[PDB]
Every structure is written in structure tokens, then in C-alpha cells.
């Protein structure tokens, strides 16, 4: 499913990401935009051979098992395909584990380079959450 800005924001707030660990909701929407383009089916392979899955582009070497990433830690204990679902619950739950591991949202290269230190508020402006 390809979400709309406000639609994804509402779904994320309902899932308790709103200001989760200090990151206001705008950070999460901004990240989803540049990571997957609001598309739940997005997949992108990395040079090291791992692949990023879903709306939040969760990585296969650490968080999920995709059956083809040698040494996958699978910390979220879930098959990577579970993250391509129209229901963002598993992505959101796994994301809360990543964001809590000490590095914050810096784990997401796109947040780091395109959202960090920007008016993230603009991403949920006009939304009825």
C-alpha cells in the first residue's frame, strides 16, 4: 500500500510512535518518505548483500530474517516479508527496537541526511490525526 502523508501519520500516532524516545511524529513521516516513498512493499538491496524492507526500510542483517542474508541476527525475530504488509504494525514494533538501541533515528541514513535538523513539523501540517 502506498500511504498518503496524513494517513501514514495517523497510523503512526495510533501505533504510539508520536514522540517515541523524543522523536516527534514529523521525524517518522519524513523518514518514511525518503526511505520508501510511503510504499509498504518497497525493497532495496545493499552492496553488502542485505536488503531493506518496508515503509521504514528495516535491514535484513540485523532485524529480520529473509532467508538470504548470511549472519542475519534477526533481532526483531520476524521474517522480512512480514514488513511489506499494508499493516504497519510489525514495522512500527521493530522500529521501536531499533530506535531504542542507543543510536536513535541515526540508524536511518535518510533521516540522518535529509530530516535531521529540518522543520520536521511541516510533514504533519494540515493533518487530522
UniProtKB/Swiss-Prot annotation:
Enzyme Commission number(s) of this protein: 3.2.1.17
GO molecular function terms attached to this record: beta-N-acetylglucosaminidase activity; identical protein binding; lysozyme activity
Listed Pfam families: Lys
Cellular component terms per the entry's GO annotation: cytoplasm; endoplasmic reticulum; extracellular space
Miscellaneous section: Lysozyme C is capable of both hydrolysis and transglycosylation; it also shows a slight esterase activity. It acts rapidly on both peptide-substituted and unsubstituted peptidoglycan, and slowly on chitin oligosaccharides.
Family note: Belongs to the glycosyl hydrolase 22 family.
Assembly and binders: Monomer.
Protein name per the record: Lysozyme C
Amino acid at each position: 500500500k502506498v500511504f498518503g502523508r496524513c494517513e501514514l501519520a495517523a497510523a503512526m500516532k495510533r501505533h504510539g510512535l508520536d514522540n517515541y524516545r523524543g522523536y516527534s511524529l514529523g521525524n517518522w513521516v519524513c523518514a518514511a518518505k525518503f526511505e520508501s516513498n510511503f510504499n509498504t512493499q518497497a525493497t532495496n538491496r545493499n552492496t553488502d548483500g542485505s536488503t531493506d524492507y518496508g515503509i521504514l526500510q528495516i535491514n535484513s542483517r540485523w532485524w529480520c530474517n529473509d532467508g538470504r542474508t548470511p549472519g542475519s541476527r534477526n533481532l526483531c525475530n520476524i521474517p522480512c516479508s512480514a514488513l511489506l504488509s499494508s499493516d504497519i504494525t510489525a514495522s512500527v514494533n521493530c522500529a521501536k527496537k531499533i530506535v531504542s538501541d542507543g543510536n536513535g533515528m541515526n540508524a536511518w541514513v535518510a533521516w540522518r541526511n535529509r530530516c535531521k535538523g529540518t522543520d520536521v513539523q511541516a510533514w504533519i501540517r494540515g493533518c487530522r490525526l
